[PDB]
């Protein structure tokens, strides 16, 4: 019989839940009611970037705080110079249904993917100076939701077939495959050491993986809807999740428990993208109500809103040096807020 | 500022290429194909392919009718769940929905999928072209008897053929009665929400009717005309 295994599973689970509860004695709200509040912070659209024909579905910041890449469902991948709003590259895509974009941490490669189930890697630097498709990765039985360049030769992707995988560009293999999710893995983020990454799926849960090891380390619950996006605290010990239930949450790795939840009654639309600031004090979250809100990472107060978009905000990313934040929305516009 | 001048020239070249691509992108209409496994949408896409990868995931069928260049996307190897990726097709000319009228057992399931597609938040303004495919099998089933569609839907006998019906010559009253019953079953959900933002265009495609492209062209022409009239506040 296997019913005994089924009941002991939840038994060995509830024991985990009560151990987590025992390890929890105080909330962040009580501890944080000492510091001076951040207060109202106003951000203005320093630069707007136009040229995309259709909605913008993803973006990434280059590792130089200057170059920007953005993918839109018109089939065009555009690389901007955020300082001068000059279109450096206008790479056209094979399939127009692109759902994710990435920038290599070297400035030489640019990745993309989407409903075509293929992660395409473009070589920015070439002998003739023309952008070419360096490699195409296949093996995902579902739409590609997110991809992050772990290295110049290694890339980790998360697709809608409840799996995440680690790929090698020079062979297009699947040396490591991360399974365990029970829904479409919507987003993932790498820790700032290229050692562990987290991935939020549609099963209202997040998991911590290990690129070197290959299996999930811990998993986090607490959400009641699909996790639309995920981020990572700069220290590497915490990460913030945004879900369709209009509530953001903070989790800690070593604590292995839910820390505190960001929410408000006025807002009702779900999250689309989250991103921490350089100091880890500001948490910027996108929304379907056409504006993104920045909340203090500790006291959970609406410091301000970046209300400047005419349609749903889909992508949002804080620069590597923290000098600026850029949001791309479905109105085919990118804005640089400071 | 020579490097700045070179960068500006490169940006100008890229912008001109972007305008050239924008003209073509705005000059074509994008359609999304939806339906169950036993809906015949594969046969429809195959016939309109000639009328004009392993994993795949998405497909394409560029057919041209009177120089309009419709793009027709059929979803391939994707998981059963479709709540998330359907947001990509929130700005398309129309959504083509194909239903197997003969299959009574899964008819209700097709009804719920059509209802969910109609009531989706991100497809509120997207019109739907309805293709009640496999009409010949539906025709032969009722004459052959031993079907009893009334058990699945306890409303057939309390129903009469609408006066709007225009049956083809030399066809039985029972077959057109059943056809219009199914069409009105879909139209009941069609005319229950959306006000005047998106509509449903039902058609009776038999198996291989070559006029499917013409029907799609006419429906898209109606949709664009309605949109333009709405922009001018006339409609």
């Amino acid at each position, epitope marked *: 019989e296997l019913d005994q295994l089924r009941q002991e599973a939840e038994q060995l689970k509830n024991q985990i839940r009560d151990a987590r509860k025992a390890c929890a004695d105080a909330t962040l709200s009580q501890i944080t009611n000492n510091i001076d509040p951040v207060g109202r912070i106003q951000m203005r659209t320093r630069r707007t970037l136009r040229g995309h024909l259709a909605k913008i579905y993803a973006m990434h910041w280059g590792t130089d705080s200057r170059l920007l890449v953005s993918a839109s469902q018109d089939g065009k991948l555009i690389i901007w110079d955020s300082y001068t709003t000059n279109k450096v590259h206008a790479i056209p895509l094979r399939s127009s249904w692109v759902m994710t974009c990435a920038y290599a941490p070297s400035g030489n490669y640019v990745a993309c993917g989407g409903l075509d189930n293929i992660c395409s890697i473009y070589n920015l630097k070439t002998r003739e100076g023309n952008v070419r498709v360096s490699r195409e990765l296949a093996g995902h039985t579902g739409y590609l939701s997110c991809c992050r360049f772990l290295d110049d030769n290694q890339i980790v992707t998360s697709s809608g077939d*409840t799996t995440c995988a680690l790929w090698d560009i020079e062979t297009g293999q699947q040396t490591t495959t991360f399974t365990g999710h029970t829904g479409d893995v919507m987003s993932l983020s790498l820790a700032p050491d290229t050692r562990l990454f987290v991935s939020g799926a549609c099963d209202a849960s997040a998991k911590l993986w290990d690129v070197r090891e290959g299996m999930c380390r811990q998993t986090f619950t607490g959400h009641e809807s699909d996790i639309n996006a995920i981020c990572f605290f700069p220290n590497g010990n915490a990460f913030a999740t945004g879900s369709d239930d209009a509530t953001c949450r903070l989790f800690d790795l070593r604590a292995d428990q839910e820390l505190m939840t960001y929410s408000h009654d006025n807002i009702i639309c779900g999250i689309t993208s989250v991103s921490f600031s350089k100091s880890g004090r500001l948490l910027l979250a996108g929304y379907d109500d056409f504006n993104c809100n920045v909340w203090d990472a500790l006291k959970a107060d609406r410091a301000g809103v970046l209300a400047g978009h005419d349609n749903r905000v889909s992508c949002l990313g804080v620069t590597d040096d923290g000098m600026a934040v850029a949001t791309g929305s479905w109105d085919s516009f990118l804005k640089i807020w400071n | 500022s020579a490097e700045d001048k070179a960068a500006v020239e490169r940006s100008k070249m890229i912008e001109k290429q972007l305008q050239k691509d924008k003209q073509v992108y705005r000059a074509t209409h994008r359609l999304l194909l939806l339906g169950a496994d036993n809906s015949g949408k594969s046969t429809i896409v195959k016939q309109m392919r000639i009328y004009h990868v392993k994993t795949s995931g998405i497909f394409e069928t560029k057919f041209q009718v009177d120089k309009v260049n419709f793009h027709m996307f059929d979803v391939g190897a994707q998981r059963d769940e479709r709540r998330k990726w*359907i947001q990509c097709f929130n700005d398309v000319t129309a959504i083509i929905f194909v239903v197997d009228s003969s299959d009574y057992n899964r008819l209700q399931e097709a009804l719920n999928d059509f209802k969910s597609i109609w009531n*989706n938040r991100w497809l509120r303004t997207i019109s739907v072209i309805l293709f009640l495919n496999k009409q010949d099998l539906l025709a032969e089933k009722v004459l052959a008897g031993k079907s009893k569609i009334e058990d699945y*839907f306890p409303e057939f006998a309390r129903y009469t053929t609408p006066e709007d019906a225009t049956p083809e010559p030399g066809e039985d009253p029972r077959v057109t009665r059943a056809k219009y019953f199914i069409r009105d079953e879909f139209l009941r959900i069609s005319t229950a929400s959306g006000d005047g933002r998106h509509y449903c265009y039902p058609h009776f495609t038999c198996s291989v009717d070559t006029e499917n492209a013409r029907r799609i062209f006419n429906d898209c022409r109606d949709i664009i005309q309605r949109m333009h009239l709405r922009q001018y506040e006339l409609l």
Partner: nanobody
Amino acid sequence: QVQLQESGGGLVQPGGSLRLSCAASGFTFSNYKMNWVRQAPGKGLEWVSDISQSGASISYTGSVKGRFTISRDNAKNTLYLQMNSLKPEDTAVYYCARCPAPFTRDCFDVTSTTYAYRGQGTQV
């Protein structure tokens, strides 16, 4: 955590009555749309009924139209399904699925083979 449990079911003579109680925890039960999905043996999952978040918009399948009734208890975060006049073809496993998006009418993928927000189910 999203947890759904079902109570009731069993084996009864044809034409009898059965009561199904669904217990939901881990989310605000008063801000969601709950659906009933049944799967007959040797057959795929079939949608049965849906209840709106306000308890007004209620629909059923034509197979059990006018015979199956539903009840929702937002205060207790529980759902009660009452059935009468059991038919020989009504034997199936019933799951009290939940629509994914809160504060909305539509909900996709309720009848999925591997839907995340679905309970284990009770055989009837």
